[PDB]
Design an enzyme around this catalytic site. Structure first.
Site, PDB file in Angstrom:
ATOM      1  N   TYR A 473       0.870  -1.208   0.000  1.00 33.84           N
ATOM      2  CA  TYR A 473       0.000   0.000   0.000  1.00 33.84           C
ATOM      3  C   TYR A 473       0.894   1.241   0.000  1.00 33.84           C
ATOM      4  O   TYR A 473       1.036   1.899  -1.027  1.00 33.84           O
ATOM      5  CB  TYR A 473      -0.919  -0.019   1.225  1.00 33.84           C
ATOM      6  CG  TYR A 473      -1.907   1.126   1.373  1.00 33.84           C
ATOM      7  CD1 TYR A 473      -3.049   1.209   0.551  1.00 33.84           C
ATOM      8  CD2 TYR A 473      -1.743   2.083   2.386  1.00 33.84           C
ATOM      9  CE1 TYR A 473      -3.986   2.240   0.694  1.00 33.84           C
ATOM     10  CE2 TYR A 473      -2.676   3.125   2.555  1.00 33.84           C
ATOM     11  CZ  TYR A 473      -3.781   3.197   1.715  1.00 33.84           C
ATOM     12  OH  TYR A 473      -4.700   4.217   1.906  1.00 33.84           O
ATOM     13  N   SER A 554      -6.566   1.247  -3.895  1.00 34.57           N
ATOM     14  CA  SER A 554      -6.742   2.645  -3.492  1.00 34.57           C
ATOM     15  C   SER A 554      -5.423   3.368  -3.713  1.00 34.57           C
ATOM     16  O   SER A 554      -4.962   3.484  -4.851  1.00 34.57           O
ATOM     17  CB  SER A 554      -7.209   2.697  -2.033  1.00 34.57           C
ATOM     18  OG  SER A 554      -7.832   3.952  -1.687  1.00 34.57           O
ATOM     19  N   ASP A 641     -18.286   3.546  -6.182  1.00 36.99           N
ATOM     20  CA  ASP A 641     -17.072   3.936  -5.455  1.00 36.99           C
ATOM     21  C   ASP A 641     -16.982   5.455  -5.366  1.00 36.99           C
ATOM     22  O   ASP A 641     -16.395   6.086  -6.245  1.00 36.99           O
ATOM     23  CB  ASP A 641     -15.779   3.361  -6.091  1.00 36.99           C
ATOM     24  CG  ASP A 641     -14.564   3.571  -5.199  1.00 36.99           C
ATOM     25  OD1 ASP A 641     -14.678   4.323  -4.200  1.00 36.99           O
ATOM     26  OD2 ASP A 641     -13.525   2.967  -5.490  1.00 36.99           O
ATOM     27  N   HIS A 680     -16.111   1.303  -2.761  1.00 36.74           N
ATOM     28  CA  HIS A 680     -14.663   1.243  -2.583  1.00 36.74           C
ATOM     29  C   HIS A 680     -14.203  -0.111  -2.013  1.00 36.74           C
ATOM     30  O   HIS A 680     -13.062  -0.552  -2.249  1.00 36.74           O
ATOM     31  CB  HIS A 680     -14.182   2.408  -1.692  1.00 36.74           C
ATOM     32  CG  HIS A 680     -12.717   2.692  -1.826  1.00 36.74           C
ATOM     33  ND1 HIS A 680     -12.117   2.948  -3.039  1.00 36.74           N
ATOM     34  CD2 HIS A 680     -11.731   2.755  -0.897  1.00 36.74           C
ATOM     35  CE1 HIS A 680     -10.827   3.180  -2.847  1.00 36.74           C
ATOM     36  NE2 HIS A 680     -10.576   3.083  -1.553  1.00 36.74           N
TER      37      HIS A 680
HETATM   38  C1  LIG Z   1      -7.481   4.622  -0.530  1.00 35.98           C
HETATM   39  O1  LIG Z   1      -6.085   4.622  -0.342  1.00 35.98           O
HETATM   40  C2  LIG Z   1      -7.883   3.891   0.750  1.00 35.98           C
HETATM   41  O2  LIG Z   1      -9.285   3.766   0.830  1.00 35.98           O
HETATM   42  C3  LIG Z   1      -7.985   6.084  -0.645  1.00 35.98           C
HETATM   43  C4  LIG Z   1      -7.215   6.835  -1.743  1.00 35.98           C
HETATM   44  C5  LIG Z   1      -6.057   7.567  -1.091  1.00 35.98           C
HETATM   45  C6  LIG Z   1      -6.349   7.579   0.410  1.00 35.98           C
HETATM   46  N1  LIG Z   1      -7.616   6.853   0.548  1.00 35.98           N
HETATM   47  C7  LIG Z   1      -8.442   6.903   1.586  1.00 35.98           C
HETATM   48  O3  LIG Z   1      -9.512   6.296   1.614  1.00 35.98           O
HETATM   49  C8  LIG Z   1      -7.974   7.727   2.741  1.00 35.98           C
HETATM   50  C9  LIG Z   1      -6.880   6.956   3.486  1.00 35.98           C
HETATM   51  C10 LIG Z   1      -7.693   6.188   4.510  1.00 35.98           C
HETATM   52  C11 LIG Z   1      -8.859   7.083   4.888  1.00 35.98           C
HETATM   53  N2  LIG Z   1      -9.039   7.924   3.709  1.00 35.98           N
HETATM   54  C12 LIG Z   1     -10.062   8.762   3.505  1.00 35.98           C
HETATM   55  O4  LIG Z   1     -10.193   9.424   2.477  1.00 35.98           O
HETATM   56  N3  LIG Z   1     -10.987   8.857   4.461  1.00 35.98           N
HETATM   57  C13 LIG Z   1     -12.172   9.719   4.386  1.00 35.98           C
HETATM   58  C14 LIG Z   1     -11.896  10.829   5.383  1.00 35.98           C
HETATM   59  C15 LIG Z   1     -12.617  10.905   6.562  1.00 35.98           C
HETATM   60  C16 LIG Z   1     -12.349  11.928   7.487  1.00 35.98           C
HETATM   61  C17 LIG Z   1     -11.338  12.864   7.236  1.00 35.98           C
HETATM   62  C18 LIG Z   1     -10.610  12.766   6.049  1.00 35.98           C
HETATM   63  C19 LIG Z   1     -10.903  11.761   5.132  1.00 35.98           C
END
Ligand SMILES: *[C@](O)(CO)[C@@H]1CCCN1C(=O)[C@@H]1CCCN1C(=O)NCc1ccccc1
Length: 710
Positions: A473, A554, A641, A680
């Protein structure tokens, strides 16, 4: 093998954008609209070639039959007590969604409390978040449809499992926290927007608000308790202190492990919760994380990374709040990451450390921070835990690459602690003793030593002949720790494979310094570490390039896509799930604005210059060498997604097919599959999980011509 034609896909050659003097063409920009007939047609035309390719070989059916058999074992969450009752989640084996059960005591008969399976025919409605009232008598729970991050919150009275009228809409990335008076619950919602809000839309998510819902009222009556209209990306999550006296507001902006921390003494409200609360801005910057553990009067214990990249515990007294006055309760370890901390039975702390990517679980004294007890574990991960301040026992769940795992129970009222196995399940068909897990540390390009787990059948000759499945990752301070995956063990057992997991930089395995080692200007470290992991497997004779498959999802889908562009000679097969492919545009959509803390943002010249070098969409290039083509590639995404909008994979596949897919030397397939009623991956029903792994491994078996081993 290419017994099919790539669909014709229109190129908008006028779509040209200037980035700080650099002209970028985006001829598939029209795929950004999920609702258009054009985009719908593209998707249909893609699935039309992908599905037959995957399902042509009998190996998919053999894999699916084996997955269905071996995945069919009982799955439990930890018990946890709420009020006078115990709860736990349980899946008999193959139910689409796990079911919440209740019992009136530890030896009482259990009954179904909440069964999400009956909410849809296909298991695509799932629980996302829940919160019991402090006394355990009322229950709030989030439902997501089709894997979308959007939630509807519903409510039940626990006694008799009675449905209540209260429904909360427009919930996303939300807290759920009841005040201890039982009157109502804090949650977050987003203002109305034009178009859809169902997980198919790409609209950015801004101006999240904190509301309080009074039980037995309509949502339109809900109280606005915090909002940040001058800071549209701030997100304020509420929790109550363990004694119910204070609401703690943790404000995040992006994905870094930092937060503002404000508090409100509820007893200081003039007349209960009636509007914006009298917040006290204890920590009013984004320089550190402050994660509430417990409090004793005005002495608050937090886990923090302030001056401590490996995390530590501090006590801040609200009545003597200057940093000079904070007490360090459990100092930072030199190497071990303090992963999480809970308070249980009033004056114990349970601390979970990560030591060379394996967990250890410890009990400490709240008053002094002193170590009291090490909970014995095998090598692997703690993946579940229960035991809050008022409780007098803990449960914790352990897992590893070779064991489905074990739930333990420890009665903390006992003078001499005796943890015991509470639930254990064995998967007959895979004999753990035929396999081994090794951990090695390989040097990356710059000399940094990177951990890697390798799992393989005992006794194999390291002659380079085995197919391998290497996962990474590398981002967002997430540690990739041992876990039980039946689908990967089928690859080992029935496809003669080697599993590998590389703990590359960007992760949290060695604290905040490991995270910062793979972000921003140093994002290329992730890709270098992962490429080096592949070279290690090959050099040491676990595999060869033409038998090596890489996989990530992701941010890990970004990882494997970039590695395909950068080192196509190194890989036979690439599976990129729900990947961030357009690094210039990711911030424009849904929650993408939150990832700029890891990636940067193309609005800045400096960041643009980093992002353009590796953005998978912008780095598709025919290999120069005549004997090198792109590996076989499969992209998996889904139409709801809304975490990583599927346009990322759509634009990327069109680009791969046009630039590389059209050249005479490319004979390896470049395919995408777009699922329906899925997102997702969170809350994906078992039936879809089984189909997805069957697609993945059938792709591998086909592209590498691997024989099934019964
Ligand atoms: C994927 O890597 C993992 O789901 C995606 C794409 C890059 C980063 N993410 C991702 O989902 C990131 C990393 C884990 C949590 N995240 C979020 O976007 N969470 C939603 C969120 C909630 C509260 C504050 C900020 C973001």
């Amino acid at each position: 093998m290419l017994s099919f034609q790539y669909p014709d896909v229109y190129r908008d050659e006028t779509a040209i954008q200037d980035y700080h003097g650099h002209k970028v063409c985006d001829p598939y920009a029209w795929l950004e609209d999920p609702d258009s007939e054009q985009t719908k047609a593209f998707v249909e035309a893609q699935n039309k070639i992908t599905v037959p390719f995957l399902e042509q070989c009998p190996i998919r059916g053999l894999y699916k039959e084996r997955m269905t058999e071996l995945y069919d074992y009982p799955k439990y969450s930890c018990h946890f007590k709420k009020g006078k009752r115990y709860f736990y989640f349980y899946n008999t084996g193959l139910q689409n969604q796990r079911v919440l059960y209740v019992q009136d005591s530890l030896e009482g008969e259990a009954r179904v409390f909440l069964d999400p399976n009956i909410l849809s025919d296909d298991g695509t409605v799932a629980l996302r978040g829940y919160a019991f009232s402090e006394d355990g008598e009322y229950f709030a729970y989030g439902l997501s449809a089709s894997g979308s991050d959007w939630v509807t919150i519903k409510f039940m009275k626990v006694d008799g499992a009675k449905e209540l009228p209260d429904v909360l809409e427009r919930v996303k990335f939300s807290c759920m926290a009841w005040t201890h008076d039982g009157k109502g619950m804090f949650y977050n919602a987003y203002p109305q927007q034009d178009g859809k809000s169902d997980g198919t839309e790409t609209s950015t998510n801004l101006h999240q608000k904190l509301y309080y819902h009074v039980l037995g009222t309509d949502q339109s009556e809900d109280i606005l308790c915090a909002e940040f209209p001058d800071e549209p990306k701030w997100m304020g999550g509420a929790e109550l202190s363990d004694d119910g006296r204070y609401v703690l507001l943790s404000i995040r902006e992006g994905c870094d492990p930092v937060n503002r921390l404000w508090y409100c003494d509820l007893q200081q409200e003039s007349n209960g919760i009636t509007g914006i609360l009298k917040w006290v801005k204890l920590i009013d910057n984004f320089e550190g994380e402050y994660d509430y553990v417990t409090n004793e009067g005005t002495v608050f214990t937090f886990k923090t990374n302030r001056h401590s990249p490996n995390y530590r515990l501090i006590n801040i007294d609200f009545t003597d709040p200057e940093e000079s006055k904070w007490k360090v309760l459990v100092p930072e370890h030199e190497k071990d990451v303090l992963e999480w901390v809970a308070c249980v039975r009033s004056n114990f702390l349970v601390l979970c450390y990560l030591h060379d990517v394996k967990n250890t679980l410890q009990l400490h004294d709240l008053a002094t921070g002193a170590l009291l007890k090490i909970f014995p574990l095998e090598v692997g991960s703690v993946v579940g835990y229960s035991g809050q301040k008022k409780d007098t026992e803990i449960f914790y769940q352990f897992t590893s690459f070779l064991s489905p795992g074990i739930i333990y129970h420890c009665d903390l009222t006992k003078e001499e602690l005796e943890p015991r196995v509470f639930r254990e399940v064995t998967v007959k068909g895979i004999d753990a003793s035929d396999y081994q897990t090794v951990q090695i540390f390989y040097p990356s390009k710059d000399g940094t030593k990177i951990p890697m787990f390798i799992v393989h059948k005992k006794g194999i000759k390291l002659d380079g002949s085995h197919p391998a499945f290497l996962y990474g990752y590398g981002g967002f301070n997430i540690s990739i720790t041992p876990n039980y995956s039946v689908s990967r063990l089928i690859f080992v057992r029935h496809m003669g494979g080697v599993l590998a997991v590389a703990n590359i930089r960007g992760g949290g395995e060695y604290g905040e310094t490991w995270h910062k080692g793979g972000i921003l200007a140093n994002k290329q470290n992730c890709f270098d570490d992962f490429q080096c992991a592949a070279e290690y497997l090959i050099k040491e004779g676990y595999t060869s390039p033409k038998r090596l498959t890489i996989n990530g999802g992701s941010n890990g889908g970004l990882l494997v896509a970039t590695c395909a562009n950068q080192r196509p000679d190194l890989f036979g097969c690439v599976i990129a799930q729900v990947g961030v492919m357009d690094m210039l545009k990711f911030h424009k959509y849904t929650i993408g604005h939150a990832w700029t803390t890891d990636y940067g943002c193309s609005d800045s010249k400096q960041h643009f210059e980093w992002l353009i070098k590796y953005s998978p969409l912008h780095n598709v290039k025919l290999p120069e060498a005549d004997d090198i083509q792109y590996p076989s590639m499969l992209l998996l995404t889904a139409d709801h997604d809304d975490r990583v909008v599927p346009l990322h994979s759509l634009k990327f596949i069109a680009t791969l097919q046009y630039i590389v897919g059209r050249s005479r030397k490319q004979n390896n397939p470049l395919l995408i599959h777009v699922d329906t009623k899925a997102g997702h991956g969170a809350g994906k029903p078992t039936a879809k999980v089984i189909e997805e792994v069957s697609d993945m491994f059938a792709f591998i078996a086909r592209c590498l011509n691997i024989d099934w081993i019964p």
